[PDB]
Design a protein around this ligand. Sequence first.
Ligand code: CC5
Ligand code: CC5
Ligand code: CC5
Ligand code: CC5
Ligand code: CC5
Ligand code: CC5
Lengths: 291, 291, 291, 291, 291, 291
Amino acid sequence: RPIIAFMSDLGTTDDSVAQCKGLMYSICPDVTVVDVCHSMTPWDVEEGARYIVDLPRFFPEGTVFATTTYPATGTTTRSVAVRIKQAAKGGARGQWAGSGAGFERAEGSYIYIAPNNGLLTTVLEEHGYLEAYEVTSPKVIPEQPEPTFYSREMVAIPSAHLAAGFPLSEVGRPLEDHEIVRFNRPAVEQDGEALVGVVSAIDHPFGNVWTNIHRTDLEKAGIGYGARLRLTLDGVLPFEAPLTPTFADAGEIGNIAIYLNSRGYLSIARNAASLAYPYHLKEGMSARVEA
Amino acid sequence: RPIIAFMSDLGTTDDSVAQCKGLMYSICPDVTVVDVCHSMTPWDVEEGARYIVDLPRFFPEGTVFATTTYPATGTTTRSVAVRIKQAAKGGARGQWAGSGAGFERAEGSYIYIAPNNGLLTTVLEEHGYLEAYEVTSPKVIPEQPEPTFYSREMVAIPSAHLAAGFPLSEVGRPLEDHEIVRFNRPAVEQDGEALVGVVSAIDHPFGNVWTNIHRTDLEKAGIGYGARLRLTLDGVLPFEAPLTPTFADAGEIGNIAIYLNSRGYLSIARNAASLAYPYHLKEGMSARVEA
Amino acid sequence: RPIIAFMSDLGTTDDSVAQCKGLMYSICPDVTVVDVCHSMTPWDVEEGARYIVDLPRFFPEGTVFATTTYPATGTTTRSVAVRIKQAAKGGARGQWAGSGAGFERAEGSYIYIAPNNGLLTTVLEEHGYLEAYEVTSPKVIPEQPEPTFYSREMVAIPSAHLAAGFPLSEVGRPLEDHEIVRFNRPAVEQDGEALVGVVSAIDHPFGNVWTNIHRTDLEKAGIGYGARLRLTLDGVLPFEAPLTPTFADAGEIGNIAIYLNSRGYLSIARNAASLAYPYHLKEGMSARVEA
Amino acid sequence: RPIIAFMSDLGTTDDSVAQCKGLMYSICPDVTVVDVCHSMTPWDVEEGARYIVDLPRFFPEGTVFATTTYPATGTTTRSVAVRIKQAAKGGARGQWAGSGAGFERAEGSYIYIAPNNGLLTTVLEEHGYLEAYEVTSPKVIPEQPEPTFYSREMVAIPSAHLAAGFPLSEVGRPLEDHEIVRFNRPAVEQDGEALVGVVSAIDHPFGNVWTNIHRTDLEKAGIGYGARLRLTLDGVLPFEAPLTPTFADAGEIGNIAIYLNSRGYLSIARNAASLAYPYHLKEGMSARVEA
Amino acid sequence: RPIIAFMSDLGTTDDSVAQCKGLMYSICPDVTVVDVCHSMTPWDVEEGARYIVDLPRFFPEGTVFATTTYPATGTTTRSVAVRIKQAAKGGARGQWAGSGAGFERAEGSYIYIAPNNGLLTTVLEEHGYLEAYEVTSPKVIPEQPEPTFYSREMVAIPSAHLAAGFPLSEVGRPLEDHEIVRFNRPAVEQDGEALVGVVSAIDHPFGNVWTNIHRTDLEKAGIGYGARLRLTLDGVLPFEAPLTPTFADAGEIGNIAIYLNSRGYLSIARNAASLAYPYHLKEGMSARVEA
Amino acid sequence: RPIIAFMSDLGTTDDSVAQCKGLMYSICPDVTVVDVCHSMTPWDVEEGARYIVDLPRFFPEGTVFATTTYPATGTTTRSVAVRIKQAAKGGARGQWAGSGAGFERAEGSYIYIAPNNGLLTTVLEEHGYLEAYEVTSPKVIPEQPEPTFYSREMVAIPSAHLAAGFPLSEVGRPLEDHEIVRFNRPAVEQDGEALVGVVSAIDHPFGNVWTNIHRTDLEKAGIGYGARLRLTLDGVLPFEAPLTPTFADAGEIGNIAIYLNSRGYLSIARNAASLAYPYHLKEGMSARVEA
Ligand SMILES: Nc1ncnc2c1ncn2[C@@H]1OC[C@@H](O)[C@H]1O
Ligand SMILES: Nc1ncnc2c1ncn2[C@@H]1OC[C@@H](O)[C@H]1O
Ligand SMILES: Nc1ncnc2c1ncn2[C@@H]1OC[C@@H](O)[C@H]1O
Ligand SMILES: Nc1ncnc2c1ncn2[C@@H]1OC[C@@H](O)[C@H]1O
Ligand SMILES: Nc1ncnc2c1ncn2[C@@H]1OC[C@@H](O)[C@H]1O
Ligand SMILES: Nc1ncnc2c1ncn2[C@@H]1OC[C@@H](O)[C@H]1O
């Protein structure tokens, strides 16, 4: 029962994803293809990273993550296939996912395959890796790859072989760490008592505002649930609420909640109302938080 | 062979649904997860209800419906899990779904699990139920649920246990009928000869206009197929057409068709043209029909 | 391991696709339903055709394509079910899909079931067919089909029977060629030595512009890779670039690439930037190319 | 004391109109320049005609109307200057404008100067004319006119000379009637009992809907104030109301009023609410009235 | 040198305002018509009132304000014409307007003529009046007024007569105070020591936000310039700044300024940037201020 | 008969402009106020400059240009009042404006009064100046200026005094050239045979594209009417046409015209169609022209 969890920038409007999947079932008949999402901003590797980084703990060990935005499609670039180390806890607390105490996931239990364009930056940062290979073997990629469709040729296709039991180390040569492209993650800076970050994401479809200010950034400033915060967005929008676990703690529908999102990050929202949408709050806006 | 049909407000733009599915495949390795849709207006329980009420007769017996919009996520609230009674005939004529004479579905064959926020109102109204349980057992939900993600913790996760054969009566204590939250459904009023309802939905992607005026409401003012009807929307934009089975009966493309939709309700459309969109017709607009 | 690849105009916003899938699993329990897309412009048979024409080669043999926009729903019209002949190579070079030299598909290995409304025009043209039948048997369609939902009644339900091994020739009588509705595709017309076609698609989500000017139209005009092209769109907007295999060949991010798409047609893009969106380029705009 | 009323497509966003006015005050120091409007759809002669046809009876005798959209700017074309015959009664009843019994205007009291591109079609149709001259004399136009600004050179400038008392017959040679460009006006057709016209204008800023069905057309099918009428727009959106003098006769705010507008034409509106805007009703939509 | 200052809801897109002006010049040839604005939300008497209430002090004595939105056009309603009492100081400090110490205006120096529909509510409140009359005399209005155009018939035309020296008291009978329709203005309400009002206007084209919280409301709460204010808008968006005289006091371009507008009310802006537009702030949003 | 030509950023939607004008008539009873435009992008001094720079030749000598966007309102900044030197020819040719050979305007014949914020940069660059004074005298400005309305206090008010004959040199102290704020005009660069500039303006309401590439830039590259040009916009849109005097020279409606606009600058448009609007071409886009 192999699983490919499939995240791409291919959209939901044509047969692009179906082509990949058709090939996945062709190569790995017993595969279950699980869509992550296909609507990421094309070529936004940092956004794509966000949709794939917290996946492992939710999936059975041995799951293969075929994750791709491939702007360098048709070039001599080749994908990277990595076996991660830690599946890694997560969420507002830092816990295993599932009922009871959650599913503890073994180490070295997930493979990601992606363009080597930095899409896996946070995956490697947060999970670490045991081994990483360039995907070159004609056994797992086309000998004549479609130039404009490396997401299919260099990710979907080899992902299905990996899911089918194709040995990871046989995809091509091992890559040294410096050969794995990374994008830079701008740090949350200490600017006084304040933590200064950005709006990392508008949380669709709700219009919640996600920051790159992590629980760990907060914990080491002393900020926990109950702490009375000023969260300033866009330089000019204080917001003031206690840090609370959830939206409803804000009381009346529409009230401001400052909370920790399911990924573990400082967030702001309204209670059963959209914060971001009516006021056109966007990713990239500044986010400062002080107690 | 078990099936969970999954309806949420989680959107299709990030890994939220994928996190749920990964846990569903984790808990119930043989499961098939069928998306209903994930694009409902967040927190709009009445709209979510529309997407799930007609589902049972389409699905194999034993299907679990994991249905969720969870505005009260992170609160002490707990989901309700119900075995419905009748799968119930549906459509313009009221029939079993499928080839030949349709597939008759044994009673008690489907479980819904949902926030106990009234999402299941029309499910219970239309199918009845045999048993209802609060979902509280740590065998089916996290001991430390993500405060902001009860749709995962309190729906997706225990739905997978239910699909995996976890005895329904073991999820929590039985709920009495008055403990199951219901929303109020606006009645269709008789106003003289007229029937007064509402545009209950714009039928995307076609821009057909669905009202809450049922066929039973029509055959109460004498109205069957063939009847010249006047249908006014938003109080001002009126329409005249016979009540016909389908769009093409309007004749020319763009012509107004008044019909019964596939859920049995008085609707208005253009034949192979959008009615709602050019005129920005919206859900919530008054709808009056008179013969 | 039966597969139904499912392409409809049903959208992704309600339970319509789920109703179809439920019945698919009801009828063929071991089936895997693979979504192609569901977001096509309703009733645009030419567009629906693009999303289905090059599917066969990507899918395991025996795959059934359930492909439907059904504007004549509720009429006396009946679907056509065809077994196509050659699975047919594609891409910018014309190959079999997959790793290695790709995966050859035996002839007569795929069935399409569709409204008989021309949706299968390009499938038949490109693949040929071995047998075509009207879908009328109450073994495979409802005796009382829902008038407004033939996509489910006359495509979804019967496709599942076909996926389950119901003999194709027993679905109804054989259709002669002339009985299979076709749409006409406008030809690429000559104007001096310029090729005049149309923008056949904006390739979402990338904003690439696809024209109906094929590789054959080009190399029949002595235009090969490396050729300096002037591409005018909408009779106004001119672009000049050499013909190149892929986007990154344009050089800097945002530079114009004129290339052949993964479907084999003259297309235009910005490199890792969206061309169509900032300029509000649309399907149906004229496209003129010249050396 | 001379007045030039100035209607152009020059917009209100730059100094274009101001350049015209400066020259108008330069040439005719005592002049009063009255803006009609400057926001007409560029090059839409029929729309510009609407803005100028009803003007004469409102203005003191001797007023010059400088009316211009000039798509043929910079060509050998020359403006036409005409002394109209009758100032003509107007409105729903047809009357002189002003207090008491209105201000009767002597015949031959108004001059229009315009591109000879049909802008004056309805002016001539409704007022008749006494004399018409091509505007060519270097005493009233630049010897070296700005190619792209004939609205200034060939309208604003000579209009100011005319206001300054430059003899009209001295502007150029007389034009014969066939040399004055006219546009074709769609006739109002009798279709059974119905009258078929068009939405001739959306009446901004109110979103009232003006048709080209005249009161004379109405009192030809027997229709006067009080008559229950059915009015359909865009073929599909029909409306029923008595024909009433004014909006408030509809009773409640938002209620449909069918009336004769201030230019004598069958119109539809809501009472103190916008009709056109919520429904995106547009000029050019068919309009059928039947009693 | 008679002046009519003209404020209507007639828009700037057709000949409506020009028809009025033509008649104004017909009746009072030496008149200067000064446009206030013509773009007010149709029928929004409260909004119309804002554009006219502080005019008198800026205008030469004897100016007539012809001020009209006329939703009850064509009814038995007649306009009111009033001579106001004190021309009344204004601004953020309360002064006479002009160079030097400004220009004092004699009392009883201005006439407003308007629908009797409350448009003059704040004019009367702020200025008082010496005399008020119903406008009925066929000397100043048409005997056959155009039903849909009372703004012209019952405001424009009679204002020109008044501008021309037609005795005010001869326009019709005197109206008692109670006969002059007033609208109610919602009060700034107390909540703790916070002032709760509304966004009374988005100050176009700047995107400044004007509230109905007046200088008096503030310094009645012990809020003076230099006071640190928290201004929450729409019950969501918080801003903090000291109260300052002007925008540039915020410092950097784009910084928040909370200030008193040139009309004397608490307002909020970005310095030389638009506040309202990026945040889609609207008139009618709640505005809460607190020290 | 003094004239104030009045250009501001005050908009057309409230009483702001009327206040200024009221004061202008108060101070200079016999004044004619001529609106330039009031809809400039607030605080965009370069845009405002464009609306005022070519004004003088169109106006009678002695005209006063009250031109203002005043983001530094309420500060210790004071306006500059300048008497220009050359009225300066203009247009595609470089000619005097008016009928015959045009109105030659004497030198030193126009005064501009503006904030000293660089709004007059091009005015001074193109016309030169004879004298310039800071506007400080309480005879021409308020002693207590409205902080947020320096466009009225420091421009409209003193402009009316200047129009009334108030001696220019008495407004305040002479300013040295270095005290007159200028904005930088980026030069058109010679990059080969090419002239590289920008899109300086979208020419509303037509959607023509104006560049800052001047006839003088062209003449000294040898480019005149008839020259076959490639005009590349936005780096990726060649356009190719001869440089022609006017739009119609492009032939068919919608054809590309490259021409010299009425201000003397290289421009591109379609013939009686909008170039900029359908494709969302904007100011600030690159503009290269080569023969
Ligand atoms: N204009 C463009 N530029 C660069 N890459 C593009 C592109 N359009 C699609 N792709 C890539 O092709 C493989 C997909 O993943 C997508 O990122
Ligand atoms: N701002 C908000 N307020 C309340 N509930 C929210 C919310 N954002 C997401 N959810 C709920 O979190 C679980 C999802 O199903 C969603 O309904
Ligand atoms: N207004 C309309 N006119 C014609 N066909 C319609 C329609 N709405 C839905 N359908 C068809 O019903 C089956 C779906 O595939 C869809 O194409
Ligand atoms: N649909 C409508 N309802 C009510 N009044 C209207 C209207 N259209 C224009 N007017 C009024 O006619 C005089 C103008 O001032 C305008 O307010
Ligand atoms: N938010 C703002 N910031 C700076 N100046 C502003 C402003 N709103 C209006 N003005 C200026 O006030 C005088 C007008 O000319 C305008 O430019
Ligand atoms: N692109 C274009 N094509 C044709 N005429 C145009 C044009 N832009 C402005 N004008 C005309 O130039 C004089 C104005 O009145 C306007 O109609």
